[PDB]
Design a protein around this ligand. Structure first.
Ligand SMILES: *[C@H](C/C=C\CC)[C@H](O)C/C=C\C/C=C\C/C=C\CCCC(=O)O
Ligand SMILES: *[C@H](C/C=C\CC)[C@H](O)C/C=C\C/C=C\C/C=C\CCCC(=O)O
Lengths: 296, 294
C-alpha cells in the first residue's frame, strides 16, 4: 500500500536503519540528494521537484521516523537522535561520496546535527522555513498584533498529558487544513483532495503522536545544538524562506549566517511556509540551480 | 437550575442591561463591591471571598456576558463593548456613589475601559493575574526552555475556523483540568466536583464560543486601550499576582505603574494563577484590608 502516488520512474521502498524501518521514495542517477520533509507532510511534498532533480541526481525522499510510512524511532525524537537514522540511510546509498541535503521545517531540526558532525559527507545544503533549534526560539512572541504567531504551535504540541493528541484525534483532517492554510500565502494550492491525502497519513495514531514528540524533544534539541554550534558549517549552503503570510522572511538567512561560513539566502515573495507547493516554479529552479553548481 | 451553589445570605438574580440578560450573585449591605471573574470560571470563583466582604459591603459577582448564566453580548466581545454592560450593571445598584472593583484574568480586559472612562464612579480598584491589553503582550514568548508557556493560549483561542471550539468540544472537562493545572501552583484545591461544575458551565455551546470570542477581540481591545491609556488612573489601586508556577510575578504591578498614579502591589509566593482558590485566605485578607481602609 502507498499513502501517496509515486512519480513515474521512482520506487517506493523501505530500509531498516538501527532497528527502525524507514520508508523512502527513490529515483534518478548520479550523485545523491536527500530531501527531508517537515511537520504535517511526508516525502510527497517533494514530488514535483523530484523528477526534475532526478535528471541529474539520484534522489531519495524518506519519511521522517513515525511519519508517513516510517516506523517511529527507537532512541528518541531529539534532533541528534533522529539525525543518526537519516545520516545512516543516506550513507547506505552514498557510502563513498558526499551527498546533498534539502530540508524543510522540522527536517532541518532532524538533519542539522548530522551535518555538523559529518561535514565531509555533506556536499551542499539547502534549508527552508524553520529555525535551527537554539536560544532564539525562546524569544519568538506567542501573540502578534497582525497576522498570527508562527510559533505558538510549539507550546501546543509540546504540552504534557498528550494534550494535542487528545484534542486532535478524530479531527485530524479539520486541524490539518487549518494549520496548513493559516501558514500559507497561496492557499489555493491546498485542494481538498491534497489535504485528504496528508490528513489520512498523519491520522495514523502512531504518526499523530510522533508528530508531537518532535516538539516534546525541542528543548533537548536546543541543548544539543548549543554544543554542536561551536563548529560552523563549511559547505555551500542556501536558505529559502517565504516572504508572504506564514513565511519566515529574513530570519532564515540571518540565523544561518551565525551557523555557516558560505551561505546565500532568498526570500520568495507571495509565498508562505509551504514553498514546494505554494511556489513550485521559483523554488524548484532555485534548488536545482544551486545543487547543479558542480558535479551532477 | 443554578450552575453553582449560592452562599447563605446571597441571592442569584438577573438584570437586563442594554437588552442582554446578565446573571449575578448579590449579598451584603453597604457600599458596592463588584467582583469580575475570568476565563474558565464564573462568579463562583469569588464564593469564599463574598461572605467575608458582605460583612462590610454590598457584594455583586456577575457572570461575564456569554459565560455562566449570562446572555452573550449583543454588541461584541471587545473590552470597551463588554465594559459597558458591567458599568451599567454596577450603576443599577450604586447610582449615587462610587463603587469598588475587583477583577481577575479577562475580568481586567472587560473592566479597564469603563474604569478609565468613568473614574468618578470607581472608588478603589483591585486587579489580579492578567495584563491590561496593550503592546506589552506582543513580547510574551511563545515557548520556554521548560516547555509550554503561559500565554500560547492567546493564539489558540484567537485562531479562526472555530479552532478552539472544534478541538475542545467533547473534551471540555479534559481541557479545563489541563489549563487549570498548567496555570496552578496548588492543584489540590480543585476537587473533582469543582472541576465538574466549571466544565459543565463553559461546555454550554454558546459559553464555549463566548470564552474564545474574548480572545478573538483581544487585538481590538489593545487598539482601543492605546487611546484610553492617555488618561492615567487616579483612584487607589492594588495589584495581586502569584509568585509560583502560573503566576505573573512582578509583571502585574510593573505594568500597572504605567497606568495608575496610586498603586500598591503584592506577589504571593507559593501561589499560581487561580488566586481566589489556590491562595484564598491571604488573597481575601489583602483584598478585604485594602478595600476597608476608611
Ligand atoms: C513547522 C511549521 C509548520 C506547521 C505549523 C503547524 C515547524 O514547526 C516550524 C517552522 C517554521 C515556523 C517557526 C519559526 C518562525 C521563525 C521566526 C519568525 C517569528 C515570527 C513569529 O510570528 O513569531
Ligand atoms: C487568563 C488565563 C487563564 C487561563 C489560561 C488558559 C488570561 O487569558 C491570561 C492571564 C494571565 C496569564 C497570562 C499572562 C502572563 C503575563 C506575563 C507573564 C510574564 C512573562 C514575560 O515574558 O515577562
Amino acid at each position: 500500500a502507498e499513502e501517496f502516488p509515486v512519480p513515474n520512474g521512482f520506487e517506493s521502498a523501505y530500509r531498516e536503519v538501527d532497528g527502525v524501518k524507514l520508508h523512502y521514495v527513490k529515483g534518478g542517477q548520479g550523485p545523491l540528494v536527500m530531501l527531508v520533509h517537515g511537520f504535517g507532510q511526508t516525502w510527497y511534498e517533494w514530488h514535483q521537484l523530484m523528477p526534475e532533480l532526478a535528471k541529474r541526481f539520484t534522489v531519495i525522499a524518506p519519511d521522517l521516523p513515525g511519519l508517513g510510512q516510517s516506523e517511529p524511532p527507537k532512541t528518541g525524537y531529539s534532533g541528534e537522535q533522529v539525525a543518526v537514522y537519516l545520516h545512516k540511510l543516506a550513507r547506505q546509498f552514498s557510502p563513498d561520496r558526499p551527498f546533498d541535503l534539502v530540508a524543510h521545517d522540522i527536517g532541518i531540526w532532524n538533519t542539522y546535527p548530522m551535518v555538523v558532525k559529518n561535514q565531509a559527507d555533506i556536499a551542499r545544503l539547502v534549508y527552508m522555513q524553520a529555525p535551527i533549534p537554539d536560544a532564539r526560539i525562546y524569544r519568538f512572541p506567542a501573540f502578534t498584533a497582525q497576522g498570527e504567531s508562527l510559533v505558538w504551535h510549539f507550546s501546543f504540541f509540546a504540552a504534557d498529558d498528550r494534550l494535542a493528541e487528545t484534542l486532535i484525534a478524530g479531527k485530524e483532517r479539520f486541524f490539518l487544513e487549518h494549520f496548513i492554510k493559516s501558514h500559507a500565502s497561496n492557499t489555493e494550492v491546498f485542494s481538498e483532495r491534497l489535504l485528504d491525502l496528508y490528513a489520512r497519513s498523519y491520522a495514523k495514531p502512531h504518526s499523530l503522536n510522533a508528530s508531537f514528540e518532535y516538539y516534546r524533544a525541542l528543548n533537548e534539541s536546543v541543548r544539543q545544538n548549543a554544543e554542536l554550534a561551536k563548529t560552523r558549517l563549511q559547505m555551500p549552503t542556501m536558505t529559502l524562506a517565504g516572504g508572504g503570510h506564514g513565511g519566515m522572511g529574513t530570519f532564515q538567512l540571518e540565523q544561518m549566517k551565525a551557523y555557516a561560513e558560505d551561505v546565500e539566502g532568498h526570500v520568495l515573495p507571495g509565498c508562505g511556509h509551504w514553498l514546494p507547493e505554494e511556489c513550485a516554479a521559483p523554488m524548484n529552479r532555485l534548488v536545482i540551480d544551486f545543487l547543479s553548481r558542480g558535479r551532477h
